[PDB]
């Protein structure tokens, strides 16, 4: 909706770090002598309401060099947000496209890909399988933006949090849906058990032949206290560029920006964990060719059963 | 040729003997029937065409392995369970069995021929390993020292009582039949294949299913190289004095590696996996390698 | 009387080996739907477009047979829990193109090992399987009463067998089937094949398996005793455990290769039944009770309700 | 399943009809003087485990015409029956494909498709989406067998079968869903009000610029009888090529054949009809880029609800 885009743009740090990310980037790939020689062809994939698209043009000013942006986005009634603008303000400049960025057949190759097409567990709006199918655009010696981004989990105890997921039963389908599926949420009242750790890992443009996004990857979380585990709170990173970067991960938190919360995944029952246990976790991406979903599983010190298998209670659309 | 009328399509096995005769096992692993056979090729050439055979044979089940016994004896590893000898005849036109011994209790995978010559050691998936008399034709010793299926297993070339093997559960052993407790622990990925240095007794290498090809000495500290990338199926060495190492894997390649491990050859002839590898007596410098594409390459080796 | 089956890892002509197995008296088979040693490729060229047919026609047999008669294995090669990424995504796609085969065929019931602690992502890509299309095939599980490890020769020179009294590290693989069915979360598809070994375990081991969803007992040639005549025979031990298993009514599979070349194939099962027969007689209440063992039913109440 | 491709191949009428429908066509499309000079590529598009592959070969034997034909089928378990039959029987004349009719890249056009993509309801199959991806394949002059077919629908009282839907309501789902999805029945105990009309009819190839499958048909059925109408019976015909059809149309039925029983759209509440009135539906043919479904609802005597919005209850899968 609109006012969805709105509350994204209503937070200047997460863009001042992509204007300063491209601007980065435009100095590496343009020297000062072919600075009026080379126009670069940036292509911000999933525009919205065109942050990024400002962004694009105040980090091209304040780098001094020349770029022409495409704008793609599938959502028509943004895209008619774009057109007024791009008529009324930008111009001829920005190449505003109506498609998707896995259909869209691109009539130039992008020196640099910008998206922003992260959740609060990373690749949750399957940012993945987009830019893999907007790949074959990008130059062979081409960037995107973001270059990098990884997630992370960390075991929490929750008695709150636990019984807030339980009341979210709803008539006319599984009686335990709801614990699983991932709620975005501001965690207030909840215990963080074990530090987080690193879960999945998305590097673009990627170069593994045969392009594989399914994942599986087990995580030892050594607690020093007794406590009952009620889910697994996630947060992630990302590289936009080099040393620029956006994060929502407690230590290495971005100051300032609140454009997510962390994401939640629960478990079916409270498990016990006694001080000097290790809780060990299992966590899978998953697809087919219509759908993206995660399932999990506590293996220690107890076993859980595997959650949302096949995707029953949640899945992501593709 | 009095054999049968159509070979197999996946070639499990290739071997020369000393004038330079070339063996040839097959299984087929799809359709309708799921057996083997035995060929001989005194024309590698010819290889692997039915209609320009010295001898060929069905026999009842598929052949995982198989290794000279000599120059007339061909002794097999059986998926019935069955260890089994065939003999060429003296016009060495036909193969007739010896024995057929059906003692392990599950798919025999590997197998191999003692110093003596009079005994052999099988590796089977029951996780046991036998020790054979090829003359009374019966098992002298069973050894479930294993945890997990028996991968591979090697006859050290100037030791009567020594033999190496290695399985799924991780372990490489080293035996000696001399002693009350034969098995002998050799200190990340599971041990695939084994071969002995032909010119030193203490000297081993195997290749894991991660693709890596190691070097090892009995004594100490060990070397390695990733040489494929995928699980490695067999490794023989050469003939030669200073003698080179042939690597072949599931990722349907073969390399010839020198003293330190060093890639001197390639070769992506197979479009399948290759299954084994052998030296040509008369010359040194070929190879002869057998896959399931039903291919049999001579790969000249620069030497 | 009993009802037993016939594991085979050997099969050449599938027509023939049921005649031979039907024969000596088995009333199933179990053995394997593709080639034990035909590993596969699913992701690296050029072995992944290896032409041909993948394996037997499902002709070969009526549609009758396949439901009545034949059980199927899942192949040794295939390792969904593997410490190799490759082996792992290879042995998944195997896995569920093997089940798959199963359900096509209409299999009553597929052989899966549990022979490690973690088989994690084997229960995940079962589950998974249980949760796709139609089918009502049972899953058992291949779960052996002592784990390889614990029963190897003692013949290591560095690394003796372990001589200390662990009570439960000796109940280990009751745990490797514990933690599979949690997983799977107890899916009534998914059950016990209990693989009795030459040793059998402490007491308390065995009882760890009361309470359990055991369907088969898969009995090795190898722990068969010879008799004064020449046949085989079971230890006391094992008696015992025969004629516990048999108030469960399970159906026993006999595996492995005739150690008693002397005699027919016959005899093993001949013995079983030999000990079907030989058992105390069901008593007034379990001759009634035949029919209704751990069937739910409400509790009657006279006073609300007129009988 | 195995069982279930059985149970089609044990319907000798349906092939001899596939048989003569390509022996009529091969001796129009090669005259006796390119008897042997001309070979027709065949394509049969969902061969399942082969029966309209071995009546293509009879069919070319009787002729006494050259073909070559190719076997695309998409399930891997029956390709294997393929396979087998292929290398003992067939030969070099078949070319088994293992793969989507909508995805395979021929490497040779067809001067003929053989298709056996019906359902009872003709297109519940998604017979026109497979089809028409499997169009680009086709010589321009090309045939397809079947060339046409259309789906009738009569309304029917059966209190029977209405009370036999309702008690197909199950835990964690809608308390109607049961109403809003057809079923295969062989209709026995029922009464037929009217007469069968046709609903929706496709014909391959499809010329139509920008080939749309969706649809919207509108049927007036004149009623004779006072009665209580609970559903819609379903039937289908299709033209294989010319003057040789196949039928479940109970008025043109094809004799003997029974690889087909009728389908039934149920609706939530019965309704009324008085002698004189007439019974109006409305059925719609939708879709999305993953789903087929139908929708339909009674406008006269009195309203129905429209049953299955946007497939909530039954959809059909790409
Ligand atoms: N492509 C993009 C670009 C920006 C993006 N922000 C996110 C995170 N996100 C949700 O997933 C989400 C789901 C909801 F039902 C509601 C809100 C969110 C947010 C967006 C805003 N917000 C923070 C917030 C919320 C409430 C506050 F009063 C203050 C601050 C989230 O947590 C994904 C994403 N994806
Ligand atoms: N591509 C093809 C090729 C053949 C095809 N037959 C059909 C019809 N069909 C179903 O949809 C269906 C759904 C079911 F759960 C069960 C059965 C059917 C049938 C197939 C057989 N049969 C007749 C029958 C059934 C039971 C009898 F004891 C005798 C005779 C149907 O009514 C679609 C189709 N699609
Ligand atoms: C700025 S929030 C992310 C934006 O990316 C857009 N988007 C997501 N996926 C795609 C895609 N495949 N092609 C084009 N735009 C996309 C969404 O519509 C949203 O406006
Ligand atoms: C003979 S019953 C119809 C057959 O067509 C096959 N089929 C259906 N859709 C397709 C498709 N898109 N590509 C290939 N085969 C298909 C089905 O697997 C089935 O065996």
């Known amino acids: 909706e609109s006012q969805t885009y709105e509350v994204f743009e209503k937070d200047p740090i997460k863009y001042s770090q992509y204007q300063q990310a491209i601007y980065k980037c435009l100095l590496d790939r343009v020297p000062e002598e072919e600075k009026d020689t080379n126009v670069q062809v940036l292509m911000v994939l999933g525009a919205g309401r065109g942050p990024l698209v400002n962004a694009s043009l105040r980090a091209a000013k304040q780098a001094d060099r020349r770029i022409k942006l495409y704008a793609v986005e599938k959502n028509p009634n943004a895209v008619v947000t774009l057109e007024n603008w791009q008529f009324e303000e930008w111009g001829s400049q920005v190449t505003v496209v109506?498609?998707?960025?896995?259909?869209?057949?691109?009539?130039?190759?992008?020196?640099?890909?910008?998206?922003?097409?992260?959740?609060?567990?990373?690749?949750?709006?399957?940012?993945?399988?987009?830019?893999?199918?907007?790949?074959?655009?990008?130059?062979?010696?081409?960037?995107?933006?973001?270059?990098?981004?990884?997630?992370?989990?960390?075991?929490?105890?929750s008695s709150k949090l636990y019984n807030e997921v339980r009341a979210?039963?709803?008539?006319?389908?599984?009686?335990?849906?709801?614990?699983?599926?991932?709620?975005?949420?501001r965690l207030h009242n909840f215990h963080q058990l074990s530090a987080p750790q690193p879960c999945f890992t998305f590097s673009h443009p990627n170069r593994d032949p045969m392009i594989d996004n399914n994942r599986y990857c087990t995580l030892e979380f050594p607690v020093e206290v007794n406590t009952v585990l009620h889910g697994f709170a996630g947060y992630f990173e990302t590289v936009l560029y080099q040393d620029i970067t956006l994060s929502i991960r407690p230590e290495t938190h971005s100051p300032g920006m609140f454009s997510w919360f962390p994401i939640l995944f629960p478990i079916k029952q409270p498990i016990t964990v006694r001080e000097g246990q290790t809780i060990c976790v299992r966590f899978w991406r998953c697809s087919?060719?219509?759908?993206?979903?995660?399932?999990?599983?506590?293996?220690?010190?107890?076993?859980?059963?595997?959650?949302?298998?096949?995707?029953?209670?949640?899945?992501?659309?593709l | 040729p009095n054999a049968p009328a159509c070979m197999e399509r996946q070639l499990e096995a290739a071997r020369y003997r000393s004038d330079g005769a070339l063996l040839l096992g097959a299984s087929s692993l799809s359709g309708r029937c799921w057996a083997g056979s035995l060929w001989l090729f005194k024309d590698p050439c010819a290889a692997p065409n039915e209609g320009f055979c010295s001898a060929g044979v069905q026999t009842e089940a598929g052949v995982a392995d198989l290794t000279w016994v000599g120059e007339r004896?061909?002794?097999?590893?059986?998926?019935?369970?069955?260890?089994?000898?065939?003999?060429?005849?003296?016009?060495?036109?036909?193969?007739?069995?010896?024995?057929?011994?059906?003692?392990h209790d599950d798919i025999v995978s590997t197998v191999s021929v003692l110093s003596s010559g009079t005994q052999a050691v099988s590796g089977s998936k029951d996780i046991c390993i036998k020790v054979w008399d090829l003359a009374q034709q019966v098992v002298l010793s069973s050894y479930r020292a294993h945890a997990a299926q028996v991968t591979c297993v090697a006859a050290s070339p100037h030791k009567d009582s020594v033999f190496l093997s290695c399985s799924e559960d991780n372990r490489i052993l080293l035996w000696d039949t001399r002693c009350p407790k034969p098995a002998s622990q050799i200190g990340g990925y599971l041990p695939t294949s084994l071969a002995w240095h032909p010119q030193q007794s203490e000297v081993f290498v195997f290749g894991d299913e991660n693709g890596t090809v190691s070097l090892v000495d009995t004594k100490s500290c060990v070397l390695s190289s990733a040489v494929h990338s995928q699980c490695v199926t067999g490794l023989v060495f050469s003939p030669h004095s200073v003698p080179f190492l042939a690597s072949l894997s599931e990722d349907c390649s073969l390399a010839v590696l020198d003293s330190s491990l060093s890639e001197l050859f390639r070769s992506q002839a197979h479009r399948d996996f290759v299954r084994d590898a052998t030296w040509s007596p008369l010359n040194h410098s070929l190879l002869t390698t057998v896959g399931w594409d039903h291919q049999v390459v001579h790969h000249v080796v620069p030497t | 009387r009993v009802s037993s089956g016939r594991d085979l890892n050997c099969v050449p002509e599938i027509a023939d080996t049921l005649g031979?197995?039907?024969?000596?008296?088995?009333?199933?088979?179990?053995?394997?739907?593709?080639?034990?040693?035909?590993?596969?490729?699913?992701?690296?060229?050029?072995?992944?477009?290896?032409?041909?047919?993948?394996?037997?026609?499902?002709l070969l047999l009526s549609g009758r047979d396949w439901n009545t008669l034949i059980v199927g294995k899942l192949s040794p090669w295939i390792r969904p829990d593997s410490k190799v990424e490759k082996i792992r995504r290879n042995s998944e796609a195997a896995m569920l193109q093997e089940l798959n085969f199963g359900a096509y065929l209409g299999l009553p019931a597929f052989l899966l090992p549990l022979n490690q602690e973690d088989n994690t992502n084997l229960a995940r890509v079962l589950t998974n399987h249980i949760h796709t299309g139609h089918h009502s095939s049972m899953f058992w599980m291949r779960v052996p009463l002592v784990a390889p490890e614990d029963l190897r020769d003692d013949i290591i020179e560095n690394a003796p067998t372990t001589h200390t009294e662990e009570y439960s590290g000796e109940?280990?693989?009751?745990?490797?089937?514990?933690?599979?069915?949690?997983?799977?979360?107890?899916?009534?598809?998914?059950?016990?094949?209990?693989?009795?070994?030459?040793?059998?375990?402490?007491?308390?081991?065995?009882?760890?398996?009361?309470?359990?969803?055991?369907?088969?007992?898969?009995?090795?040639?190898?722990?068969?005793?010879?008799?004064?005549?020449?046949?085989?025979?079971?230890?006391?031990?094992?008696?015992?455990?025969?004629?516990?298993?048999?108030?469960?009514?399970?159906?026993?599979?006999?595996?492995?290769?005739?150690?008693?070349?002397?005699?027919?194939?016959?005899?093993?099962?001949?013995?079983?039944?030999?000990?079907?027969?030989?058992?105390?007689?069901?008593?007034?209440?379990?001759?009634?009770?035949?029919?209704?063992?751990?069937?739910?039913?409400?509790?009657?109440?006279?006073?609300?309700?007129?009988?």
């Not at chain 1, 979210?168 to 949420?185: G, N």
């Not at chain 3, 199933?28 to 590993?39: A, I, N, Q, S």
């Not at chain 3, 477009?49 to 026609?57: F, I, L, Y």
């Not at chain 3, 099962?269 to 009634?288: D, K, T, V």
Request: glycine share 4%; aromatic share 12%.
């Open chain 1, 98 to 157: 109506s498609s998707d960025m896995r259909e869209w057949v691109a009539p130039e190759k992008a020196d640099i890909i910008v998206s922003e097409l992260l959740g609060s567990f990373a690749d949750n709006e399957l940012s993945p399988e987009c830019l893999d199918g907007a790949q074959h655009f990008l130059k062979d010696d081409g960037v995107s933006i973001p270059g990098e981004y990884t997630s992370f989990l960390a075991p929490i105890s």
């Open chain 1, 168 to 185: 979210c039963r709803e008539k006319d389908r599984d009686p335990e849906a709801q614990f699983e599926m991932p709620y975005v949420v």
């Open chain 1, 288 to 317: 087919n060719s219509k759908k993206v979903w995660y399932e999990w599983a506590v293996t220690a010190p107890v076993c859980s059963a595997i959650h949302n298998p096949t995707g029953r209670s949640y899945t992501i659309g």
């Open chain 2, 73 to 103: 004896g061909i002794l097999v590893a059986s998926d019935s369970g069955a260890v089994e000898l065939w003999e060429l005849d003296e016009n060495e036109t036909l193969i007739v069995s010896k024995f057929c011994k059906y003692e």
């Open chain 3, 20 to 58: 031979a197995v039907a024969k000596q008296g088995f009333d199933f088979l179990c053995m394997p739907v593709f080639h034990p040693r035909f590993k596969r490729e699913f992701i690296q060229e050029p072995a992944k477009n290896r032409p041909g047919p993948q394996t037997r026609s499902d």
């Open chain 3, 171 to 307: 109940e280990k693989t009751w745990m490797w089937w514990h933690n599979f069915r949690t997983l799977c979360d107890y899916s009534k598809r998914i059950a016990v094949a209990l693989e009795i070994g030459a040793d059998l375990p402490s007491n308390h081991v065995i009882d760890r398996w009361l309470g359990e969803p055991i369907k088969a007992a898969i009995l090795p040639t190898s722990i068969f005793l010879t008799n004064k005549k020449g046949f085989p025979v079971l230890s006391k031990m094992h008696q015992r455990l025969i004629f516990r298993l048999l108030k469960l009514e399970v159906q026993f599979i006999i595996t492995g290769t005739n150690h008693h070349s002397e005699k027919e194939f016959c005899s093993y099962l001949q013995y079983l039944e030999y000990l079907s027969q030989n058992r105390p007689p069901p008593n007034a209440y379990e001759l009634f009770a035949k029919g209704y063992e751990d069937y739910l039913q409400s509790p009657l109440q006279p006073l609300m309700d007129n009988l």
